[PDB]
Amino acid sequence: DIVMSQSPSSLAVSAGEKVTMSCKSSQSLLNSRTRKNYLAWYQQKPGQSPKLLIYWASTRESGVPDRFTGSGSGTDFTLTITSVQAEDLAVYYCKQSYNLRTFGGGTKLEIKRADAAPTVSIFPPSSEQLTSGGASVVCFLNNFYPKDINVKWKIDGSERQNGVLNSWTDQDSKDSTYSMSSTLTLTKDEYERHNSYTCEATHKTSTSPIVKSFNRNEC
Amino acid sequence: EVKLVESGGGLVQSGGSLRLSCATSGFTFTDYYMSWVRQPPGKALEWLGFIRNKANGYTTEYSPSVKGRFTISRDNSQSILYLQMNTLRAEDSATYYCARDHDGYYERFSYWGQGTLVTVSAAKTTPPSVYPLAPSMVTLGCLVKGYFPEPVTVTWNSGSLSSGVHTFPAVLQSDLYTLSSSVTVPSSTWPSETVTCNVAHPASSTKVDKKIVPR
Numbered sequence: 545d546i547v548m549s550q551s552p553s554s555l556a557v558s559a560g561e562k563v564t565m566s567c568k569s570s571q572s573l574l575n576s577r578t579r580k581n582y583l584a585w586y587q588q589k590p591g592q593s594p595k596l597l598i599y600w601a602s603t604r605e606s607g608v609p610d611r612f613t614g615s616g617s618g619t620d621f622t623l624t625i626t627s628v629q630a631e632d633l634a635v636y637y638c639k640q641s642y643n644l645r646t647f648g649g650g651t652k653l654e655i656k657r658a659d660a661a662p663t664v665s666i667f668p669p670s671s672e673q674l675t676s677g678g679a680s681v682v683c684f685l686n687n688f689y690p691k692d693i694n695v696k697w698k699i700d701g702s703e704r705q706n707g708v709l710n711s712w713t714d715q716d717s718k719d720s721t722y723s724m725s726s727t728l729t730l731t732k733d734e735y736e737r738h739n740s741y742t743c744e745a746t747h748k749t750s751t752s753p754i755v756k757s758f759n760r761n762e763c
Numbered sequence: 764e765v766k767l768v769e770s771g772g773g774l775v776q777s778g779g780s781l782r783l784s785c786a787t788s789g790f791t792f793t794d795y796y797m798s799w800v801r802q803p804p805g806k807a808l809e810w811l812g813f814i815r816n817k818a819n820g821y822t823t824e825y826s827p828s829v830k831g832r833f834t835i836s837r838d839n840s841q842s843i844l845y846l847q848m849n850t851l852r853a854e855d856s857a858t859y860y861c862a863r864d865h866d867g868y869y870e871r872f873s874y875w876g877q878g879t880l881v882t883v884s885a886a887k888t889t890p891p892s893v894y895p896l897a898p899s900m901v902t903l904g905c906l907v908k909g910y911f912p913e914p915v916t917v918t919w920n921s922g923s924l925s926s927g928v929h930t931f932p933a934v935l936q937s938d939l940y941t942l943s944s945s946v947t948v949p950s951s952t953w954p955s956e957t958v959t960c961n962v963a964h965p966a967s968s969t970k971v972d973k974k975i976v977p978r
């Protein structure tokens with residue numbers, strides 16, 4: 545019956561700044577026998593398993609940088625990270641072990657950085673895909689910041705929005721950028737009717753869209 | 764070195780059963796409680812159950828979410844932890860992790876496995892099509908199209924190309940997933956040297972090495 549709740553849901557901090565986040569328990573976690581609060585913090589970096597940081601509310605696991613400090617008692621806990629590094633990008637979970645175990649809902653820490661324009665590349669469909677009746681055109685928009693970006697696809701100069709799938713990465717753990725992939729899928733018969741295939745990226749870094757294109761006649 | 768390695772995840776139909784295992788090494792297994800925790804994609808960690816240590820009779824406990832439906836056991840001869848899941852439902856689709864738990868002294872989960880992914884679905888296993896993406900620096904890629912279930916793995920040059928890789932989360936469409944991966948190297952080095960994407964889809968035992976050929 546122990547409810548764990550974390551605050552904020554998410555936030556972003558620039559490298560070198562302080563981060564503080566909260567963990568509340570619906571009942572005290574202070575065990576009276578041992579005089580310790582049974583509250584641990586775990587860090588879960590994008591694509592990895594959770595890693596133990598802090599336990600008994602304030603004991604920092606060996607190998608954990610001293611920039612991480614757990615504090616609090618009873619029903620209220622805090623994790624502070626001083627001089628945050630790009631590598632600290634993660635979801636942070638608190639977890640009680642007073643009565644069985646229960647995790648909080650997590651705090652997503654993002655890293656704020658300087659605005660950066662994407663590096664855009666476009667790719668025609670492979671001969672092997674075309675042999676099978678389909679045609680996917682791929683556009684990568686790499687290493688940009690902030691995450692918000694617009695991509696339009698133009699075929700023979702006319703926008704086309706149907707048949708498009710977009711995917712963003714998690715933020716990068718070393719450069720704090722995002723990347724995005726955009727895939728336009730057409731029939732082979734439709735693909736063979738048009739010449740110019742264009743991916744256009746509009747990001748806050750420039751008023752000019754970044755335009756990458758290929759012509760089928762030049763393939 | 765402490766090792767925990769989960770196995771047993773994959774695709775199972777609603778109403779079916781599945782048993783996971785967790786192979787451990789590098790510590791006195793019988794001294795430790797062991798927990799299972801799951802995580803639906805994009806969502807929070809959820810504790811499922813533990814099995815206690817020898818000192819406590821290897822007795823078990825469960826979250827109310829799975830009590831009656833999931834069973835935890837352990838093989839103390841081989842230091843292997845198990846999770847039996849029955850009457851699976853859509854909401855059981857998740858990465859399952861085993862974690863080393865309490866030793867009588869410390870309140871902490873010191874170590875976690877890599878996780879194994881369970882998908883509960885009526886859809887069929889479909890292997891991916893893998894396509895090469897050829898055009899100072901050069902960006903190359905692979906398109907990994909039309910597979911089910913998750914996951915797939917993508918490496919470049921058997922993993923020796925790791926920096927400047929971006930592998931994009933799969934997107935689900937018409938009951939199939941598609942993902943892509945980019946790699947960026949110096950143009951003096953490709954096509955001068957070979958660049959290959961290595962794709963695996965455990966569900967269909969698919970292994971693919973796609974060399975990125977110019978022109």
Ligand SMILES: C=CCO[C@@]1(C(=O)O)O[C@H]([C@H](O)CO)[C@H](O)[C@H](O)[C@@H]1O
Nearest residue numbers: 575582641642643644815819865870
């Ligand atoms: C005498 C053993 C009790 O230990 C357990 C247990 O097994 O229930 O319970 C402890 C409680 O503080 C009650 O003492 C902790 O939750 C501990 O982690 C473990 O789950």
Ligand SMILES: [Mg+2]
Nearest residue numbers: 699734737738
């Ligand atoms: Mg048209």
Ligand SMILES: [Zn+2]
Nearest residue numbers: 822823824825
């Ligand atoms: Zn009991």
